[PDB]
């Protein structure tokens, strides 16, 4: 979308800003997601 480029990518700093924010949130999702996936993968064999 042009909006993205026009607003988020056009300014190099914003390009970084978006990356920064994204990084701040990516961890949360990826961690939790992978954790659960892992949890499901080894659904029964764990400490619980």
């Amino acid at each position: 979308p042009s909006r993205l480029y026009s607003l988020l990518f056009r300014r190099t700093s914003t390009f970084a800003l978006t990356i920064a924010v994204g990084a701040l949130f990516f961890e949360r999702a990826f961690d939790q997601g992978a954790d659960a996936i892992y949890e499901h993968i080894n659904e029964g064999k764990l400490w619980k």
Binding site: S2, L4, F9, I19, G22, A23, F26, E27, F30
Partner: protein, 55 residues
């Protein structure tokens, strides 16, 4: 341009995620390990210390 710049931002975030983690792990390594982490234990005996003596 957007699509291309999109790819890079994405790649950037990826490297960042892993970067933060590995570094954290290493810094975590230097951090006191469990070996010394466990030190809560303490043993005391009141009779040994008479009034006016520090131990």
């Amino acid at each position: 341009k957007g699509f291309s710049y999109l790819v890079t931002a994405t790649t950037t975030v990826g490297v960042a995620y892993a970067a933060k983690n590995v570094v954290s792990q290493f810094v975590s390594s230097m951090s006191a390990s469990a070996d010394v982490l466990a030190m809560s234990k303490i043993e005391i005996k009141l009779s040994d210390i008479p009034e006016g003596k520090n131990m």
